[PDB]
Symmetry: none
Subunit: 223 residues, 3 copies
């Protein structure tokens, strides 16, 4: 039978390699090289090890971050572009016209963007201070928003995100917060359940088609 064997070349260190990650996430080598250490360190720190859990994590994070390219929202909105916030009752039509980008403006200045954020997130998610709306705007692979959540996420990572919220726009912390979210919010209790996991992450079913495509592709590589 020419068997005589059964042993590991090296003790531990058996994790997803960059090739598997690249193919599973569907990104180019440049992005894969950039994110590989952060995603694996984060998955390892929180025990996201089962192939299907890893596949779902990579797929959901891939969807939320626009394919691992965006880590924060911006407020470069036109007056009409603020209609969504108006419909949600986050800003008034009057305010939208005063702050929104005008037809004759190239890009909305920071002081204007900041003003919009401070208004839209005013007295929401624990923001109870001047500048909180903008300072705690959405950041991360999986978007974290508002003082209350930067605080809870910070306690979950042992990082003072209340004092340094901008850390979530840095790769290592963006990856760790996403893994903490995925784990803490119970996504590993619904392995293989795309709809339930998406509900937990998105609080809805937005982008389910893309999430499915990403999960299917990751699962084929890892599982």
């Amino acid at each position: 039978h020419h068997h005589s064997s059964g042993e590991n070349l090296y003790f531990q260190g058996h994790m997803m390699d960059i090739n598997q990650f690249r193919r599973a996430s569907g990104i180019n080598e440049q992005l894969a090289a950039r994110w590989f250490p952060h995603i694996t360190t984060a998955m390892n720190e929180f025990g996201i090890t089962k192939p299907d859990d890893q596949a779902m994590f990579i797929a959901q994070v891939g969807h939320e971050s626009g394919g691992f390219t965006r880590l924060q929202e911006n407020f470069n909105y036109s007056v009409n572009g603020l209609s969504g916030f108006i419909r949600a009752g986050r800003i008034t039509p009057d305010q939208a016209n005063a702050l929104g980008r005008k037809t004759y403006e190239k890009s909305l200045p920071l002081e204007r963007q900041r003003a919009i954020a401070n208004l839209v997130y005013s007295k929401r998610m624990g923001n109870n201070g001047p500048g909180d709306g903008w300072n705690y705007r959405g950041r991360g692979l999986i978007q974290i928003t508002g003082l209350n959540n930067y605080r809870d996420c910070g306690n979950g990572l042992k990082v003072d995100l209340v004092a340094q919220p901008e850390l979530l726009a840095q790769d290592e912390y963006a990856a760790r917060s996403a893994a903490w979210f995925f784990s803490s919010k119970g996504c590993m209790k619904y392995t293989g359940d795309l709809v339930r996991v998406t509900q937990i992450i998105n609080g809805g079913q937005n982008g389910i088609d893309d999430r499915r495509t990403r999960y299917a592709a990751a699962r084929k590589v890892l599982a």
Copy 2:
């Protein structure tokens, strides 16, 4: 001597890792992944940072929750099982005969259990409502019982447990309430003192041997 100045690779984020936790708690990887975020987030929120304190917290919670597997009591009592409650004048013989589980019954339907609980905890520990006995039954890693205690615990976590007592049966809140209990009740004032911390948590020395074994194991791993 080939000595280079020392420094941290990353800013903050220096907390117990999943492996240390799994090892110190003595549970399998599945339970470790489930509880890791909740236990660490809870310990970080209340400053349970010293190795010996973390070891004691993990061991005590480990003992109280049956190895991190039980978060609430049930009232699936047979007639004989209600012996203790009757002797303690918590319920009368007839009530126990009528509600208790009979020989022809596999288990007690919720309706029966609720009745027993509403009877046993009637007008005790602040309960002053028809279904308070059952609604405020014991929940959490470290068991919390009665309106008065869900109320105090709620003020401690800034969570309305009086309105939503069931939250203590959820991992995140079960973990936070345990950390709040451990800190508020003064367990960190007696680091390493197994007997005193046990008296504080149990109101006696019940299960002291199991607690000692768990603490020794966690201590060997963490301290």
Copy 3:
């Protein structure tokens, strides 16, 4: 034209050869044969593929490891040799005299080397246990020191370096940890930028001239 369609002789397996590695690193045939597998395996695992990135990795690691010859610091210090640590406030004159190597001693006994390390790194970089100073002393091509850093590195490699820190003194892990460090800390985000990369690796500009010489040499060979 005597053309002919290209095509690879073999499918994949296209990596830096030992000759290229030897010339790029500037080490003897013996050391090259020793490190070749570990350096290439690590570079492949973390996607260090661009010639300029490979050249910088090899140069920086070459500098930190004293030409690929040292993988750990030692605490074989004489009483007066501990003057540096006293100046840095890591040990007292009394302790240096008690522990330091004496004139009649050929080398410092291990029990005292441990004592010095336990003092020097006490309460630093996450060390909060009795023998953490010595157990997490500097190891690796790029020196890793302290519980905090062995923990993060361990999560980055999926190796329990908290339980087995000595693994970093072994070639394979020393290589992977360096590759992980290089990638995770963002060195590939500053390809060709000697000063930026050096700042990330050293936290300063010590040995910049030598790093420059090694980089030019490696780049000349690989780029």
